[PDB]
Amino acid sequence: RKPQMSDFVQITSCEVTFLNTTHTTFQEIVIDYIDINKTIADMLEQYHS
Amino acid sequence: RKPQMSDFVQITSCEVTFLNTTHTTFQEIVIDYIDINKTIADMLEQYHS
Amino acid sequence: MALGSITSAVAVPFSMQVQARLNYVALQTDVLQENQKILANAFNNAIGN
Numbered sequence: 001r002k003p004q005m006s007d008f009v010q011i012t013s014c015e016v017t018f019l020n021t022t023h024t025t026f027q028e029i030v031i032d033y034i035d036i037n038k039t040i041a042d043m044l045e046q047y048h049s
Numbered sequence: 050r051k052p053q054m055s056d057f058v059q060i061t062s063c064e065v066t067f068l069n070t071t072h073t074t075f076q077e078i079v080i081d082y083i084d085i086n087k088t089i090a091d092m093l094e095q096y097h098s
Numbered sequence: 099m100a101l102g103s104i105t106s107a108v109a110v111p112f113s114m115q116v117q118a119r120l121n122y123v124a125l126q127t128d129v130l131q132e133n134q135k136i137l138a139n140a141f142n143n144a145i146g147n
């Protein structure tokens with residue numbers, strides 16, 4: 001199944017056993033992880049257009 | 050580890066066994082609890098500045 | 099215990115085997131190299147006695 005954010009516990013180490021990932025490809029891996037800051041800029045320019 | 054919002058189930062009683070907390074110090078205890086209403090006012094004044 | 103994968107003759111290190119078996123008691127968050135030593139030396143001195 002696809003993952004959700006409720007299956008991930010946040011710690012501080014991330015040793016070599018993990019999977020190397022960047023910010024943009026995190027959002028297509030897990031569903032409905034929404035950083036609000038990128039979203040609000042979309043409806044801000046859509047409002048004044 | 051630090052807590053997330055997925056470890057807290059919401060009920061209605063909160064007897065004396067609990068920990069007394071106010072709204073502002075709830076947000077530094079638990080990570081990524083985001084009330085959207087305080088956030089959107091920040092990017093609203095940053096947009097028209 | 100040394101074999102986990104049927105169709106690949108590569109084998110798992112035994113230190114991974116114990117580190118996995120700690121997680122079923124409680125989810126290990128931060129792991130250190132010092133914790134591996136005190137388990138192992140007490141293990142090896144147990145077999146010698």
Ligand SMILES: *[C@@H]1O[C@H](CO)[C@@H](O[C@@H]2O[C@H](CO)[C@@H](O[C@@H]3O[C@H](CO[C@H]4O[C@H](CO)[C@@H](O)[C@H](O)[C@@H]4O)[C@@H](O)[C@H](O[C@H]4O[C@H](CO)[C@@H](O)[C@H](O)[C@@H]4O)[C@@H]3O)[C@H](O)[C@H]2NC(C)=O)[C@H](O)[C@H]1NC(C)=O
Binds near residue numbers: 143144145146147
């Ligand atoms: C049956 O079980 C007993 C109980 O564990 C074993 O006895 C242990 O034997 C080991 C090996 O000799 C001992 O471990 C060694 O301890 C040395 C220091 O001991 C002194 O200082 C400590 C405090 O720091 C005091 O508690 C202690 O009373 C002593 O005064 C270290 O020098 C050793 O480490 C050094 O060598 C190892 C490599 O061998 C390196 O890893 C270290 O870097 C270092 O240079 C060492 O770990 C242990 O103290 C004994 N326990 C007890 C309670 O006495 C028996 O060996 C075991 N029988 C077997 C296996 O047949």
Ligand SMILES: *[C@@H]1O[C@H](CO)[C@@H](O[C@@H]2O[C@H](CO)[C@@H](O)[C@H](O)[C@H]2NC(C)=O)[C@H](O)[C@H]1NC(C)=O
Binds near residue numbers: 017018
């Ligand atoms: C994910 O990327 C990091 C960053 O390079 C990798 O960490 C390296 O691991 C090797 C092998 O242990 C070390 O020699 C390097 O020094 C490490 N780099 C850093 C910056 O710490 C990690 O192994 C990668 N994970 C993989 C490939 O699964």
Ligand SMILES: *[C@@H]1O[C@H](CO)[C@@H](O[C@@H]2O[C@H](CO)[C@@H](O)[C@H](O)[C@H]2NC(C)=O)[C@H](O)[C@H]1NC(C)=O
Binds near residue numbers: 064067
């Ligand atoms: C958290 O605060 C509430 C509010 O005061 C505390 O509830 C009081 O508990 C005492 C002891 O049982 C009662 O005598 C009071 O009447 C209670 N007050 C109210 C308004 O109900 C609660 O005990 C506190 N929790 C602690 C200190 O752990």
Ligand SMILES: *[C@@H]1O[C@H](CO)[C@@H](O)[C@H](O)[C@H]1NC(C)=O
Binds near residue numbers: 022024
């Ligand atoms: C990752 O962190 C580095 C260090 O600051 C930064 O330069 C880079 O932009 C970050 N990657 C992102 C934000 O995708």
Ligand SMILES: *[C@@H]1O[C@H](CO)[C@@H](O)[C@H](O)[C@H]1NC(C)=O
Binds near residue numbers: 035036037091
């Ligand atoms: C969004 O941007 C604001 C402005 O700096 C910042 O305070 C907030 O923490 C950001 N939200 C995140 C990182 O989730």
Ligand SMILES: *[C@@H]1O[C@H](CO)[C@@H](O)[C@H](O)[C@H]1NC(C)=O
Binds near residue numbers: 071072073
């Ligand atoms: C807690 O509730 C009381 C009751 O309405 C309110 O006056 C107070 O402002 C609240 N505290 C907050 C919002 O931090």
Ligand SMILES: *[C@@H]1O[C@H](CO)[C@@H](O)[C@H](O)[C@H]1NC(C)=O
Binds near residue numbers: 084085086
């Ligand atoms: C944010 O404010 C609006 C305006 O009243 C309200 O309808 C909404 O419930 C608020 N969001 C909360 C309390 O999470």
